[PDB]
Amino acid sequence: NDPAKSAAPYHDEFPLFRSANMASPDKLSTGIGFHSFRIPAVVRTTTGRILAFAEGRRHTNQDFGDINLVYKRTKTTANNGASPSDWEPLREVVGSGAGTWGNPTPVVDDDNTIYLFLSWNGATYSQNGKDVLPDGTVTKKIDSTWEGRRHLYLTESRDDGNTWSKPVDLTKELTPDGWAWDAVGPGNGIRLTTGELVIPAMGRNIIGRGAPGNRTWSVQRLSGAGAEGTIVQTPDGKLYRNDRPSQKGYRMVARGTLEGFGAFAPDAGLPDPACQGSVLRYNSDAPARTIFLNSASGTSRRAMRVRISYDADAKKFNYGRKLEDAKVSGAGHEGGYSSMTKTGDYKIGALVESDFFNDGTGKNSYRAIIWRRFNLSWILNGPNN
Ligand SMILES: O=C(O)[C@]1(F)O[C@@H]([C@H](O)[C@H](O)CO)[C@H](O)[C@@H](O)[C@H]1F
Ligand SMILES: O=C(O)[C@]1(F)O[C@@H]([C@H](O)[C@H](O)CO)[C@H](O)[C@@H](O)[C@H]1F
Ligand SMILES: *[C@]1(C(=O)O)O[C@@H]([C@H](O)[C@H](O)CO)[C@H](O)[C@@H](O)[C@H]1F
Ligand SMILES: [Cl-]
Ligand code: NA
To answer: What is the CATH number of domain 1-385?
Structure first.
């Protein structure tokens, strides 16, 4: 079988975004703190530096209200984020206004420009409407007006994540007209063997063409796609969308190319409780591997499972390994949204939400984000394969 199984298994895990209830909570240099951190995204840059993004949810764990896009980088290009002291303090990409800056969806381009697509909504709008903000204000439902719709923003870094451009609004260009709710990712985009960028979004892929870091963007509309999509290029070189379902059950999968996709259909091999997931191209040479991470349950977010597919079209994934085999203590109950990258030292790097659950499903439940490193051997030597 997989020759990587013969390596010494390795795993390494600790909280990277520490909620307000924890010792040494993560705050900006300006003193700004956050109740909860949610919605992770992680990329390794061409230098080997690792950039980890999240939504800094200022006041509660809710998806609406004042939410800033925060991040951490590894201190050097070479440390691979192996220990807590390897990581810089919390920084901010964008936090302007009392609205929502979220859905981090980064992609590293060939020139090392890091593109970060984001969603935005106004301070007084929420997905469902009639939600109560900290000051008692009742939100309006997100609608199709300019003020009340979800926007699509793009920021980039030319200095290995050190600084970020003021986000530009690309809603009119890259979001279909008449839309209200929208989402990009969250998680990551990809660079294809043939050179294009592909960013998964609600109902569509965003395609980047042309010179690295100077791309032209267009929209590839997808029939039957989900709101929260993932994208990978499979070993056969084709495209693969693996999306969160609208109802609990299974991941929704479609395959295609830049010239078009086939139908979405449930993947019976990948149970999902209606939650975001992540997918990663690990390598293309024998055995070629695609990695997948989600909560492997039709009902629960607390069943995080990392898996490998050796299939040229990622038809079938193995059982993989439960993340709870390498449990983190003192950071709540692991499970929820995730993001993965390959590290510079031949590991998979994963960000995974965790929930203290101190207020149950309520707004005051503190949310933190765990950073994991593990090798293929660790996945393959799991007891349930
Ligand atoms: O055994 C595996 O690794 C697996 F679970 O089943 C494999 C396949 O069905 C045979 O077990 C090996 O040829 C798939 O190719 C793999 O992607 C995976 F799903
Ligand atoms: O959905 C779940 O699995 C859960 F039961 O509820 C989640 C959350 O409170 C609800 O999904 C509502 O947002 C927790 O993060 C999970 O740890 C778990 F408790
Ligand atoms: C997420 C969740 O925790 O379930 O849900 C999305 C969104 O509500 C769903 O995809 C349905 O459209 C939020 O945007 C995200 O912030 C998070 F809460
Ligand atoms: Cl969504
Ligand atoms: Na803000």
So the answer is: 2.120.10.10
